[PDB]
Structure formats: structure tokens, C-alpha cells
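User: hey, got a sec? need Lanosterol 14-alpha demethylase folded
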Amino acid sequence: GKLPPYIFSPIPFLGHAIAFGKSPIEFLENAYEKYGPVFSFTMVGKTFTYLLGSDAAALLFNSKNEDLNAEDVYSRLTTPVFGKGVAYDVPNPVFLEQKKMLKSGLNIAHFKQHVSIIEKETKEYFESWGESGEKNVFEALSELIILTASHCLHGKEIRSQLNEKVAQLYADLDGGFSHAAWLLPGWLPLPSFRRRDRAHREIKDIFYKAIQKRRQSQEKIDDILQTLLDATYKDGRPLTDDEVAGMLIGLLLAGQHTSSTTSAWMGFFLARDKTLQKKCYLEQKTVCGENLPPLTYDQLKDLNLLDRCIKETLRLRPPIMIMMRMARTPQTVAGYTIPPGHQVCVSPTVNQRLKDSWVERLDFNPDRYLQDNPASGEKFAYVPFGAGRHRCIGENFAYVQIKTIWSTMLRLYEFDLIDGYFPTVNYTTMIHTPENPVIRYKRRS
Ligand code: HEM
Ligand SMILES: COc1ccc(OC)c(/C(=C\c2ccc(O)c(OC)c2)C(=O)NCCc2ccc(O)cc2)c1
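Assistant: Yep! Here you go:
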């Protein structure tokens, strides 16, 4: 076997940590240009064997959990925040069973009501923005998305109980995903660690109360929570309340910040492309209805231009820029054998802005998919939600949430950038959020 082309680090242990923190996408891009598609790293005592390009990423996107173990990478971070016996804590077959049980709930029947729920919530929430002014797009969209995700997934019982205190609790729970989670161990009683732990206990307690109330409820209502409760394991064991709580606080916490940043990025891209925003509003006027009636899942499929805009936003600025895996058996890609112990990586951000196939890589143009383009030509060139075996179980929910939030938002206002300052990428956060998000909005005529 041959080890993959190994980059050389001046620092023995820390490696390229500072460079990756400063500019991960650019660092990966130049490393690709200099050492091919299978260049390796050395970051904090770990070898980050990145796979760039479709051919290299095919290994990660077609690998099995017996070969590329996600748990050995994500357990120490996801177990304390989500719960025990849920998410990545369980073995891989139980994890697959949980994933399919969750995917069963997110169906067309539930989406038909989710569209109306999200439309109502965004129409009510964006009343405070007034006729015109400037606002923090990222935070407002995060607050809207947490409301909509709660109302749709957890149900009216949980949504009604939602207030500023529990919103801050959810923000604190998301605060568990940070640098300290990776570098520092689960031994130090850091105040961030104890905040996350207390938030998880309080959230699970209120969720236990809500689950008991729903179970005792006589009236039958179809929801994600009800579907999870009715559905049992493959063997036949009824789902425990602890497991159900873990499922739902995993679902919502996994879509609150990977959907807020995408919505904000699409908003800024549409503000920069005023002609594209005008075309999108014209579509909202013509294909949904001249009187602009409330949206429905049937009309969602008619918003092809908005779908293309969301696709281009995800291509340029993916929320999840890295999907890590832990090698445990020797694997070969591009002729280079990766020994077990290397943190096999993949970049759903660099994979979509490579100049080899993505022409005008950094140019926002939601018309590329109208013609032939890598997203259809190549297997794993456009992978914002993942592809192959490892995909998001809620990409449909994301495409029905963002395309119902932004449809109403474009129906309401006429977004326009301020001082021509397109927000940059804040690499400090694990999900790259726009830097200083401020937009000068005006009410649509
Ligand atoms: C633009 C929106 C979103 C993007 C780009 C995105 C991206 C991703 C990606 C790339 C993965 C793969 C992680 C892995 O394979 O290790 C993932 C996993 C996941 N996604 Fe999302 N996500 C989004 C929103 C959502 C939404 C709305 C939900 C609603 C349920 C959700 C639920 C999940 C869950 C539970 C996982 C767990 C891992 C798995 O399913 O394999 N995400 N997401
Ligand atoms: C902001 O919270 C997130 C958001 C998105 C994530 O995945 C896209 C993750 C993550 C791992 C992750 C950890 C730290 C990170 O910094 C990160 O990148 C943002 C990602 C993960 O898979 N969650 C869901 C796991 C799960 C599976 C099955 C189930 O039934 C219930 C839950 C964490």
C-alpha cells in the first residue's frame, strides 16, 4: 500500500490548525491544487485525509459504517447534547432503524400542513420589521426557523410552551457544538459544558411532560411526535419517551442552524442580484396566483426558479462544509491506501466550487442547472445534503421550509443590500454564518 500524498507541517503537533481556522476553504483549495485530490493533514494529533473531487468523495459517500465509522468522530459531541440511546450513541443498525423511523414521519401528508404552518408563522413574525429599515438577517431568520421547526416537528403543545427562555436554552444547547467539544475532553467542568448539560436536562424534562400530555390526550392528531410514538422498533419494542425526546431534540437542533444560515445566504445573494429577485417575485405573482393565495405543497413544486436559487445558495455556501468519518479498515481511493485511524474527510463546499467542472465557480447564477452542469453530470459534485448512503433525512423538510419562508418573505418585502457590502463568511462558527448581516429592506408594492 501507498500512503496518500502527505502535507508537511512546520509545527509538530498543532499542525495547520491556525491556517484551517483562518481560511479552511482556501486552504483546502490550494492544497488540492498542490497535492492532488487525496492530500492529508496533521491537525491536533489527527490525520485529516481529505477527499476532494467526485472520484475521491465516492469512497466516503458509498462507504459502510463498518468501514467509515461516523460514531467514533461524532459521539463525544452529539451524545451529551442530544441524549443517551439516541442519535450516534446506539450501534449502527439501531441508528439506521432510528433514521428510517424519523424519515417515516416527514412525508407529503405532514408537509401539506407544514407549508401552511410555516407561512402563517413567518407572516406573523415578520410584522415587527415594519415598512422599511435594516435588521440582522441571520438572527431574525434563526428565530423564525426555530419557531417554525418547533411548530411543525414537535407539535402545537411544544410550540405554545416556547418562549425566550427556552429559545435561549436551545441556543445554549447548540453552543455545545464548538471548538471545546473537539479539543477539550468531557472531563473539565467548563461553564459552557455545564450550561449545555443543564439545558439538555431541562429540555428533556419539559419534553417528557409534553410527551406524557400528548400520550394522555384523547384526540388523535397527526404529527412527527405522534408518528414517532405510534411507530415501534423493527424488533417490536415500543419507542421509549427518552428515545423519542432524543430523536426530536436531534431533529430540531440539526435543522435550526443549518437552515438559518442558508436562508440568510440566499437572502443576501438575491439582494445582490436585484434582477433575480424581481424574477423570483414575478414567479410568485404568476405561478402561485395573481391574488397571491396562501401556499400549499402542490404549489411548492411550481417554484422552479426559487428551487434553483436555493440550490445555488447551498452550492456556494453549504452549511455543513465537512462530513467527517473515522477509518477503521484499510481503504483505497485514487490508488492511495488510507490506514485505519485517519479522520477521513470530505468537503461539500470545495466539492461544489472546483474550477475543474463548476464554471464561474464563485459566481451566483441559478440558471446553470437549466443547462448541463455537474449537479447532474457527476455523481458527487453537488452534495450539499450528502449523497449515496449518507444523506440528510430532512432535505425534503428543508426544501419545504426554506422555500415557504422565502416565498412569503419575497411576497412581503423587496430586499436590497446596504452600501453594496455583501456579508463575508464568519469562519469562527462551525456553521459558516454571514459576517455582519444587515439588509435595507422595503415593503413590496
Ligand atoms: C439547508 C438545509 C440543510 C442542510 C444543507 C443539511 C445538511 C446535512 C448533511 C450534509 C447531513 C449529513 C451528515 C452526515 O452524513 O454525517 C445532514 C444530516 C442530518 N440532517 Fe440536515 N441539513 C439541513 C437541514 C436539515 C433539516 C431541515 C432537517 C430536519 C429533520 C435535518 C435533519 C438532519 C439529521 C437528523 C441528520 C442526521 C444525520 C443523518 O441523517 O445522516 N437537517 N444534514
Ligand atoms: C447544530 O447541530 C447540528 C446540526 C447538524 C448536524 O449534522 C448535519 C449535527 C451533527 C453532527 C455535528 C456536530 C458538530 C458540528 O460542529 C457539526 O457541524 C455543524 C455537526 C448531526 O449529525 N446531528 C444529528 C444527529 C442525529 C442523528 C439521528 C437522530 O435520530 C438524531 C440526531 C449537529
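Quick note: The chain has one domain: 17-443. Let me know if you need anything else on Lanosterol 14-alpha demethylase.
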